[PDB]
Amino acid sequence: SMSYTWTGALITPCAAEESKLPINPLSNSLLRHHNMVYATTSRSASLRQKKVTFDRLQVLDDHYRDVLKEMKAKASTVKAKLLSIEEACKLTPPHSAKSKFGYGAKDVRNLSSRAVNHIRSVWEDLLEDTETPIDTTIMAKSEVFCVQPGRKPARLIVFPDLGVRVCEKMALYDVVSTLPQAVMGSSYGFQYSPKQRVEFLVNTWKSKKCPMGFSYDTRCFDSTVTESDIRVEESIYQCCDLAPEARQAIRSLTERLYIGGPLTNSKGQNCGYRRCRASGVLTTSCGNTLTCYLKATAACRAAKLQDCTMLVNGDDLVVICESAGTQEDAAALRAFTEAMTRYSAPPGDPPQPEYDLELITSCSSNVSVAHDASGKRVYYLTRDPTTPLARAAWETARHTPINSWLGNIIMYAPTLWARMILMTHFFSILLAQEQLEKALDCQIYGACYSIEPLDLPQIIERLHGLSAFTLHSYSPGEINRVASCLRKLGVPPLRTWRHRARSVRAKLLSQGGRAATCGRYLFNWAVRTKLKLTPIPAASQLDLSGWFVAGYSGGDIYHS
């Protein structure tokens, strides 16, 4: 069927939308070419609409069915619990879109009578009505990027009302948080921290006699997901031991919300109908991960790739296997692509076999190597800094609910660019405004967290190790990419950042306390006379296990 059907009504904005990087004095110290930075708006909605609207083609085969049964067999060991309205409420982000039934996120979190009673009525409705399509809202997403040799059309987000979202958590939060790992095991990407992902990728790469790997980009994955995929996805959920009400909610949610439904713009107009994956539901990440894994695992058998190992994060996929030669590898890959195409997962960028791990990009990142103080090689996760820097520039020119720069500092703490630039720039600004102690929100694997800047040293030590504060001698390729990026965006050269860093470092030390800890560890690279970096006490008590359990992008999840 058609992923979408449109009535003609437009995808409209909720309020005024900014596209150009604002007028301010602090962003310019980060990057001078501000005209290269832009945010997507609803004005480009029609372009995305054209791209995501098409008739899907899907032909299943024995390999697909064999893998599905294998997945259900593992799903069968799971026992999911029903969340209480109170538990489900606490997971709701403070800034979650308000309900159109007289209440918002705050009321939900406060368990206000008006919110709880309506949520309860939505739940009962899910137990009684098994057919009526649930209404959703479709909006153009606002995201920041840097122009390319031009601009990207805004993506479309589709989500149900706040009440329905709370009900989703009640019935499926435990499922989407535990099942993926039980079904895919080591292949489930979100169970890893950046350091662990690298370890998994490096070990997997070293386990092959002659390794060959590739990233597979599915063209607009969400719209390639068919009604059949969503029901197959549910059949896996149904293998879990579930409470009767959870089982009915999952069944109802599947037919009423997940497989499709009517779209309404921000002005309450009927925009059309969806018959593919909605981006803003609790099962999007889990569902995409399961579906991608299922199709890829089956495609590999069809293509006859030797000893395949998948790493899947939602619609993102990387496959590492045994090489059978250059010609055979390229032929097998093309066979793989055809299999995926039949499963309704056609490629955007055609895949290409890689024989160098560092050249494989997955989750917009790649594994690279550097050296610690003692000169020992260390593997870490990095990525092209273009988007991170553009967004950091934007978040500097104006307030944003989520601080991507903080998230990028945590996930990419070992990188040459995060240390030289993001840390220096943001700590410098925080000092000036005297907000080093204020907690800021950021996202990790879609879930929202509240982080205190001054706790960064501990966090980084725990997630990356002490080597994150001593890495040097980065690879030629990594250095080239960072340098090119800085030249392109008009970002000051290393010398300027070292100077700014020395100054930030000094101010931080004179303040003592945690600030002084930030000064010693985060900026040890800026000074000539190094300081001996020993394990930080608070880094031995950090409860960071819950940070890397599952994916929640689009899930409206908040962890306090």
Ligand X SMILES: COc1ccc(C(=O)Nc2ccc(Oc3ccc(N(C(=O)[C@H]4CC[C@H](C)CC4)C(C)C)c(C(=O)O)c3)cc2)cc1
| 419 sits near ligand X (criterion: CB under 6 A) | yes
- Collapsing DSSP to helix, strand or coil, 257 comes out as helix
- Collapsing DSSP to helix, strand or coil, 112 comes out as coil
Q: In Å, what is the CA distance from 265 to each residue of 275, 318, 424, 446?
A: 17, 35, 42, 24
| 420 sits near ligand X (criterion: CB under 6 A) | yes
Spatial distance between the Cα atoms of 321 and 316, rounded to a whole number of angstroms: 17
At residue 119, what are phi and psi to the nearest 5 degrees? -55, -45
Q: How far is the CB of 548 from ligand X (least distance, A)?
A: 25
| 380 sits near Mg ion (criterion: CB under 5 A) | no
Among 173, 445, 525, 558, binds ligand X (CB under 6 A): 525
Q: In Å, what is the CA distance from 542 to each residue of 307, 445, 555?
A: 37, 19, 25
Q: Which of 3, 1, 554, 53 is nearest to 274 (CA)?
A: 3
Among 483, 509, 538, 549, binds ligand X (CB under 6 A): 483
At residue 368, what are phi and psi to the nearest 5 degrees? -140, 170
Q: Which residue number, 17 or 217, has a Cβ lying nearer to Mg ion?
A: 217
Tokens 């997630």 belong to residue: 463
Point out which residues pair with 212 in neighbouring strands: 321
Spatial distance between the Cα atoms of 140 and 154, rounded to a whole number of angstroms: 6
Stretch near Mg ion under the rule CB under 5 A, chosen from 108-116, 261-269, 280-288, 546-554: 546-554
| 474 sits near ligand X (criterion: CB under 6 A) | yes
| 378 sits near ligand X (criterion: CB under 6 A) | no
Q: How far is the CB of 472 from ligand X (least distance, A)?
A: 4
* Residue 487's binding partner out of ligand X, Mg ion, none, with CB under 5 to 8 Å set by partner kind: ligand X
Question: Interior CA angle at 396 toward 14 and 493, to 5°?
Answer: 140
Spatial distance between the Cα atoms of 34 and 241, rounded to a whole number of angstroms: 54
Q: Which residue number, 185 or 493, has a Cβ lying nearer to ligand X?
A: 493
Residue 217 marked in a binding site? yes
Q: In Å, what is the CA distance from 334 to each residue of 310, 352, 409?
A: 17, 9, 38
| 530 sits near ligand X (criterion: CB under 6 A) | no
Q: Which residue number, 278 or 420, has a Cβ lying nearer to ligand X?
A: 420
* Residue 345's binding partner out of Mg ion, ligand X, none, with CB under 5 to 8 Å set by partner kind: none
| 405 sits near Mg ion (criterion: CB under 5 A) | no
- Footprint of ligand X on residues 188-227 (CB under 6 A)? none
Count CB-CB contacts under 10 A for residue 356: 11
Binding mask 212-231 toward Mg ion (x if CB under 5 A, else -) reads: -----x--------------
* Residue 525's binding partner out of Mg ion, ligand X, none, with CB under 5 to 8 Å set by partner kind: ligand X
* Residue 448's binding partner out of ligand X, Mg ion, none, with CB under 5 to 8 Å set by partner kind: none
How would you classify the pairing of strands 261-264 and 136-140? parallel
Spatial distance between the Cα atoms of 423 and 523, rounded to a whole number of angstroms: 8
* Residue 548's binding partner out of Mg ion, ligand X, none, with CB under 5 to 8 Å set by partner kind: Mg ion
Q: Which residue number, 71 or 491, has a Cβ lying nearer to ligand X?
A: 491
Among 190, 214, 445, 548, binds Mg ion (CB under 5 A): 548
Q: How far is the CB of 536 from Mg ion (least distance, A)?
A: 20
Q: Which residue number, 54 or 101, has a Cβ lying nearer to Mg ion?
A: 54
Residue 222 marked in a binding site? no
Q: In Å, what is the CA distance from 374 to each residue of 370, 509, 530?
A: 11, 25, 13
Spatial distance between the Cα atoms of 47 and 64, rounded to a whole number of angstroms: 33
Q: Which residue type, as a one-letter code, is found at position 116? A: V
| 486 sits near ligand X (criterion: CB under 6 A) | yes
| 479 sits near ligand X (criterion: CB under 6 A) | yes
In sequence order, which residues have a C-beta less than 8 Å from that of residue 193 and are 6 or more positions away? 463, 544, 547, 548
Spatial distance between the Cα atoms of 211 and 196, rounded to a whole number of angstroms: 20
Q: Which residue number, 298 or 418, has a Cβ lying nearer to ligand X?
A: 418
* Residue 51's binding partner out of ligand X, Mg ion, none, with CB under 5 to 8 Å set by partner kind: none
Q: Determine the size of the site formed for Mg ion (CB under 5 A).
A: 2
| 489 sits near ligand X (criterion: CB under 6 A) | no
Stretch near Mg ion under the rule CB under 5 A, chosen from 179-187, 210-218, 241-249, 457-465: 210-218
Q: How far is the CB of 176 from Mg ion (least distance, A)?
A: 16
Q: Which residue number, 340 or 482, has a Cβ lying nearer to Mg ion?
A: 340
Q: Determine the size of the site formed for ligand X (CB under 6 A).
A: 15
Q: Which of 264, 190, 357, 208 is nearest to 10 (CA)?
A: 264
* Residue 37's binding partner out of Mg ion, ligand X, none, with CB under 5 to 8 Å set by partner kind: none
| Span between the terminal Cα atoms of the chain, in Å | 41
Stretch near Mg ion under the rule CB under 5 A, chosen from 127-135, 160-168, 357-365, 547-555: 547-555
Q: State the residues that interact with ligand X by CB under 6 A.
A: 416, 419-420, 472-474, 479, 482-483, 486-487, 491, 493-494, 525
Annotated binding site: 217, 315-316
Residues annotated in the binding site for Mg(2+), as ranges? 217, 315-316
